[PDB]
Amino acid sequence: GDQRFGDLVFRQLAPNVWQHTSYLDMGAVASNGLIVRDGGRVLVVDTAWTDDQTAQILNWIKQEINLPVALAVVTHAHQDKMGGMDALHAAGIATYANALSNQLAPQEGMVAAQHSLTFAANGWVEPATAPNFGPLKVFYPGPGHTSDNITVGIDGTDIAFGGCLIKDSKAKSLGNLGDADTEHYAASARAFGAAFPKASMIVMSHSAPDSRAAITHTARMADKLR
Ligand SMILES: [Au+]
Ligand SMILES: [Au+]
Ligand SMILES: [Au+]
C-alpha cells in the first residue's frame, strides 16, 4: 500500500486522506504527516524534514491528486514538522501554526508560518484563527512533547493526528524529551484522546498508524515522568 515517490513514501489511509513520510539520517528516521483532499482543494498537515522533501510532497500531490494546495498547518516548531516551510512559501501556500510555534520558530531554527492559531482554555482552536480549515479540527492538548504541540482531527473520517505527542502502543520510550514538559505530558495525551473520542486510527510522527491504545499507553508512560 506504500507508494515510493523520490525519497518519500505515501500511503492512502482513507478515500481522501494520505500519510506522507520523509526520512533524515540522524540511521534514517521517518517522520509522518498528512494530506487531505477536501472537494476541489488539498490541505497538508506538517512539512517534511527539508525544503527539498517538502517540494516533493507538492509534486506528488500534483501527480496523484491534481488539485491546488489551499493551506498547510504544522504541529510544532521542530525540524520534522516545520523544516520545509520555505518550500510551501515558495509555492504560495498559506501556512498556519500555533502562535507559540511561530514565536519559538527563530530560536528553534525554523521559518515561522504566515498565520497564527490561538486556542480557548479548553484547547479548541479559536475558529476565526483557522479560516477555511474544512475537515481539519485543530486541538491544543496542553504542553507535552513541546509546549507548542498541536493535534488535528480529520472530520468525516476515523482519523486523528497526534504528531509527536503520541507514540504507538509498542513504544518503549517517549522519544526525544529535550523540549518536553514532563509534568503536564500525561494530561495532555489524555486530553487529545478526550478531544477526538471516536477516532479509531491514530496517526503519529514516528510510528505507523495505531489504535486508540497508543493514546493510553503514551499517557501511562508519561505518568512515570512525574
Ligand atoms: Au519535536
Ligand atoms: Au528546542
Ligand atoms: Au518528532
Residue numbers in the entry: 42 to 67, 71 to 270
Authors' text:
Au-bound NDM-1 was first obtained by incubating apo-NDM-1 with 10 molar equivalents of AUR overnight at 25 °C and then co-crystallized using a typical sitting-drop vapor diffusion method. Two Au ions, viz, Au282 and Au283 were clearly observed in the active site, tetrahedrally coordinated to Cys208, His250, Asp124, a water molecule (w291), and His122, His120, His189, and a water molecule (w410), respectively. The distance between two Au ions (~3.8 Å) is much shorter than that between two Zn ions (~4.6 Å) in the intact NDM-1 crystal. An additional Au ion (Au281) resided in the interface of two protein monomers coordinating to Asp223, Glu152, a water molecule, and a Glu227 from an adjacent NDM-1 molecule in a distorted tetrahedral geometry. The bond lengths of Au(I) with the side-chains of those amino acid residues were overall in the range of 1.9–2.5 Å and generally comparable to those for Zn(II). The occupancies of the three Au ions were ca. 0.5 with the Au283 in the Zn1 site showing slightly lower occupancy (0.45). The active-site pocket of NDM-1 in the crystal structure was widely open and two Au ions resided in the bottom of the cavity, apparently being assessable to AUR. Overall, the data agreed well with our biophysical characterization that the Zn-dependent hydrolysis function of NDM-1 was inhibited by AUR through displacement of the Zn(II) in the active. Our crystallographic analysis confirmed the binding of Au(I) species to the cysteine residue at the active site of NDM-1. Unlike bismuth, each AUR displaces one Zn(II) and tetrahedrally coordinated to respective three residues in either Zn1 or Zn2 site of NDM-1.
